Design goal:
Number of helices: 4
Shape: elongated
Function: Responsible for the release of ribosomes from messenger RNA at the termination of protein biosynthesis. May increase the efficiency of translation by recycling ribosomes from one round of translation to another.
Protein name: Ribosome-recycling factor
Family: Belongs to the RRF family.
Strand order of the largest sheet: 3-4-6-5
Number of domains: 2
Structural class: alpha+beta
Keywords: Cytoplasm, Protein biosynthesis
CATH superfamily of the largest domain: Ribosome-recycling factor
Oligomer: monomer
GO molecular function: ribosomal large subunit binding
CATH class of the largest domain: Mainly Alpha
């Protein structure tokens, strides 16, 4: 049927979708002490007045796990990436000839604590959004005519199906990361 439910789904979807998308965005690009090509991925380099990643400019690969190597085939993207990488990686990258070798201080006992605690706040923030989604969406049903059984029932499952998505989506992100974060 076509009732207030549609508004609940649309509101619940846009709210959860944006929350998980941005949430994963923080974990996918966080400042991981590990020499991973992922954290970055958006090494926006200036090319004659054009901002583009190093997808068709050079190539980045991990040689010893605790190292990141960026190779800018062109001399034009060498200067930009240097400033770009240092911005996101927040480290001192070395450039020789036409290759860039980046090594970050061994993520020791304390180092692991930095990322883990940083993700730790992220995970808690995600749940806060999800709760509000079900709590907010529910308010819409209870607001309609003050009581909606047909709506509340269909709206709850709809809200639950979406909520569970974030539940499995969030825990899945941390579970994987733990294997990497605690890998050391």
């Amino acid at each position: 049927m076509i009732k207030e439910l549609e508004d609940i789904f649309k509101e619940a979807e846009k709210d959860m979708k944006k929350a998980v998308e941005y949430y994963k965005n923080e974990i996918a690009g966080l400042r991981t002490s590990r020499a991973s090509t992922a954290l970055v991925e958006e090494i926006k380099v200036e090319y004659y007045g054009s901002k583009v990643p190093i997808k068709q400019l050079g190539t980045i690969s991990v040689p010893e796990h605790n190292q990141i190597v960026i190779q800018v085939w062109d001399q034009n993207a060498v200067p930009a990436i240097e400033k770009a990488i240092r911005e996101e990686l927040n480290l001192n990258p070395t450039v020789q000839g036409n290759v860039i070798r980046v090594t970050l201080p061994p993520l020791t006992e304390e180092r692991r604590r930095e990322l883990v605690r940083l993700l730790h706040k992220i995970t808690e923030e995600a749940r806060v959004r999800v709760r509000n989604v079900r709590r907010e969406a529910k308010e819409m049903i209870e607001e309609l005519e003050g009581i909606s059984e047909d709506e509340k029932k269909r709206a709850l499952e709809r809200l639950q199906k979406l909520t569970d998505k974030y539940i499995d989506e969030i825990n899945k992100l941390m579970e994987a990361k733990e294997k990497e974060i605690m890998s050391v």
